[model samples]
Target: THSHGLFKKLGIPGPTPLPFLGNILSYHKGFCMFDMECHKKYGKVWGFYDGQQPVLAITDPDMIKTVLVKECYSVFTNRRPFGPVGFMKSAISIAEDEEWKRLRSLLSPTFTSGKLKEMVPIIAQYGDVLVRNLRREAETGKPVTLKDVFGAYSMDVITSTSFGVNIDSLNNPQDPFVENTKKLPFFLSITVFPFLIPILEVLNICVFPREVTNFLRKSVKRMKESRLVDFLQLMIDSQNSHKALSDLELVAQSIIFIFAGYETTSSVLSFIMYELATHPDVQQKLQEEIDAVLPNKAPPTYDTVLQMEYLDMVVNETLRLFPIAMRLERVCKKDVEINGMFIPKGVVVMIPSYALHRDPKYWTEPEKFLPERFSKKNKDNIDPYIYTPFGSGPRNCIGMRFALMNMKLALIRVLQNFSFKPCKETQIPLKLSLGGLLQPEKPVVLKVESR
Candidate 1:
């Protein structure tokens, strides 16, 4: 039968569920934008059942803060479990309990400011190539697919830094690395939606095709053989230690880095470009700051890029409206109660970040693009818990610093060479694709003009 309105009995509000199926149909049809009307239909803290798993979709910032920031971090160590997929359980994202902690500890030092600083020249080198590609498009009067163009740059950076492999996907879009990267989202989609999973498993399918997985594994092995000073090297270097990662663990970590790193940065950069095109005044102010900061239009160093206050604000503002991860989820370890609502052990808890970011209570003119909302003066007044673009607390994004540096570096090089303007194909208000990650339904097309 039904869980019998278990949540309702405890005074938590929610949608009524049908026996056995629950909200699977809703989730199947509406992935990211599913909750667009949900917050209004149910209150900030409302529940939905995924089959039998009770998911509490919360936009209440205070309650989210407790789930994310409290020392009960131990109580919610794993992400909401996706059905088992081949090799994915090896990743840090899906790793539970001790495995997550071990992987996090091993990987933490790899993204330190010192490590990213050392990698700035590498980022800038590819960033210059990115600008050159765009400049060529600007000269030819061709509309650029900003995601693919930016994806190449992000791809180049992730590949080189993570595996020490250097190739230009911007020039050669046919590169296998680029091809594999593009195919990954489609493969990942098989894992994200639950109902499709059983059929795939029954057919004896691997979410990642054997050929693709073999190619990447070979690529990892080839790079590891070089003894290069990069993430592959770092993981290889640690294999002899008592807490060493196995060869499979090493490959999985590298995949996580590449998977997590490139797509998210490319999406954010594309969104920033769109926002700048739409908000000319904001763009002008950012340009003014950029001009003053790097007067000579030199390659941006880690320190120099960090000093650009307005650039930081623009990136922060873009992240607020269009986060790559639409929602954050955690699986509860034990029964818990907060603010008069009781949550049982094994419930999947959701922080509806898209709704939270746009809630009028926490933000004024929540739908508008306003970089000043994140300015130094106003930023301090906002609660840290409410405005988490990279997420919060112990398990927050480990690669945030690396991603931010890459974004600033790309923007600096591209903005110094050219300016983005909307073209005939540009969608005024973006229609987001309901993929594993939210992307524009069509390519984010823009006209490029030389500065």
Candidate 2:
């Protein structure tokens, strides 16, 4: 930790550890929840060394705003270096400059609010299927795991929207593509062998699973063959018109959007239901709002979903506390100054959503579950940077609108058809289910009774 004296002004000392591990053992694993502990003890801006790598964790709102919005994409030019294990041609999350601009521009038309407006029917349509399935589950007296259902629901929506791969994941959960999703958390370059990855980089080889690679290529090929004018078709049209994307970039985009747009939103929607099941008072209040909006509807329509203001707040609040993408990491491309701390070039900085969401300064009684925080009048009080579940700036989640649109429609439809009551099986103290996104630790085991 040679930089200790140099970065002392940034605040806090490195966690004690062996020379090689460098706090990797204590601070990195199951103890990762230790990040909250780190933030609390060290204050807003702190520096540390993890496995010989210099790390900075910033909770300062102004600093977050500067990195994401004010000075814009200056410090870090684009997504952090996950490297080529991902689809290089299609990976918007890790690309920059001409590559980032070209792919994002092509995919833009597909996500236009206008296109999604028309796709409301699609959300509503799949939503009805979900409601019907849950209604049947209600008669059995056994609990339904929303964590599983929402993934299926998410797959249905994105498959139709992105790749047009309408396989029945809701009914048949054994799909290989769906099964491999569990591997995603380990597969992500962030959590995997951080040290091992860089070593592989020198040799120019990949460490990601072969099954994942096969899945992407096969799915993209099938989607490309289909004649449907879905989102892939739209990207192709953009490519046709602009002539910017290379052949691999265009085809690989099918794989990129499918994986990118699916799991994070799915886990979020399911986690929302899990929260609702445990908090009956909140659920009752939400059901009342649902009753007022779409009373007696077995399968709610698209318009009914939009009328769900209270439900909207429920989602916003849950996302505030338990966002799927809990950490935002960026590398400083050039030196930048904030609150008198000059962050040097090539250093990694993080604004952890899990930590920021619970910041006492930004959130009053931050530990409590209260959707009222997001109500129209109170929402203005929230520091904009602190509430960013989908992130802020150019690299913010591009599929957010689509994600919300699908979740809202899906949740309302199921709730309208049946009532969910908490069961003994529910896992307490909401924990991140092991994987890529923030999945619930267990199925939201709620007694489902027909409305």
Candidate 3:
């Protein structure tokens, strides 16, 4: 009742809330569509509630720039204050202010170009396994679910790259690591209901189950004891040069790495497969670029993958159409006016990136799959603030470069060996699920054939 009139009192337009549920019920259709509907009806700036919490949704490019970039350090240093509880809270993704600054600075070097180059062969090794698996499936002549295939691939890559332990999840799908990680999505309830966090915490519940957390804790301890030179080892090494991170903090970061790295990258990879299957011309063009770069089916080196301009464009377009993070939110640290809009302290400022990516004012045909929008000549014509797939700011995704490299490497390997075509089971217009991550509601089944 008390929360119902705040938007009206502030003179912000939005769909009216229904008591305790607020505008969350409207998201039943999925956030991407709900956001577009809201933007069409209420314009760039509007207010909504997520279980009594007032959220200021902004699609105005100038305001987005102000919140995510210009004033990030001064006024919007922290994301919305609802995330993992318990030891997982120490993760850099949800850490606030100075703690975030410290962790970010320490972890930034792990993803440098030099470090990523060192990881090329490791990722390619997994890519080989992926191709071998897919080739066998291609022989069967049955439609394949791209998500299941890429999910295992992403898990293998992340575990090997970040944790220094090769679970070989591609071959061993029943590994405890994969099985436990699958159960973690039960934690998404916190994102939908922030009010439950305190209750969850008081009850000693966590985003990760005890078994999964314990497994990772033991793994991190083992990695620290060993002389492995990987992402986790890099964090272990940072302790000597800076404010030392405790063992729990190290485990927290490791868990966050698996959580952030796997599903997001895999989801994008699946979407890329679906889009290319539906649009054969784009796939052919990308294959041309891949062939030109790596003639005679040569293994892709870091340099070779980067040289595929068309591949980069396809990945960008897929991200634009199905951004892994559908919405980005930052809490106002203090009352401030941006572009004449008075945003009060503690209000969650939301950037509905899916809607922004599809807005007709910013894109030519927002729904169409046009990779040309990201071409070298045409990309300059687009504004950076409006096309924030990886976000745009100091607090953007830390593993963005790593994710791109992994995706590109996998694509090059798969395309070299096989091609995709939409099967009878393929959904003509992809239906997305209602959740934090952007994923197809149904399994993305596409027919695979060897080249």
Task: Give the number of colliding residue pairs in candidate 3.
Answer: 0
Encode model 1's per-residue lDDT on 1-451: one tens digit a residue: 3564778776777767777667656765445556756787777777888766688887766787778877345676778766435675778877988888888888887778888888888777898789778888899998888988898899999888887667788786576677776665544454334667666656656655656667788877776666545677766776753377877788878878888877898899889999998888888888878889888787788999999999999999899898778788888898887655677887888877776677777889998999999889998878766677788877899889989998999998888878778898899888777555677777788888998
lDDT on C-alpha atoms for all candidate structures: 0.79, 0.69, 0.86
TM-score of each: 0.92, 0.88, 0.95
Q: Specify the highest-lDDT model's number.
A: 3
1-451, model 3: which lDDT tens digit per residue? 4677878988999999887777877877887888999999999789998767889999878889999999999999998776447777789998999898888888888889899999999998989889888988999999898887898889888888887667667676586666767764554455456777787778877757777888778867776777645788778877764588788988888888888878888889999999999999999898888888899889999998888889999999999998878899999999999999898887899999899889998898888999999999898988878888888899998888999999999999999889899998899899788765588888799999998
For 58-154, candidate 2 gives per-residue lDDT tens digits of 7788888788876555665565566436455356666776677666777777787788787786666677667666767777788787756677777
Which regions in candidate 3 have their CA more than 4 angstroms from the true location?
173-176, 184-196
Candidate 2 residues lying further than 4 Å off, grouped into runs, are 1-6, 9-18, 28-32, 83-86, 172-208, 225-229, 241-243, 298-304, 433-437
Q: Listing every candidate in turn, what is its Cα RMSD in Å to the true structure after a full C-alpha superposition?
A: 2.7, 3.3, 2.0
Output the worst ten-in-a-row residue range by lDDT, candidate 3. Answer: 183-192
Model 3 residue pairs with clashes: none
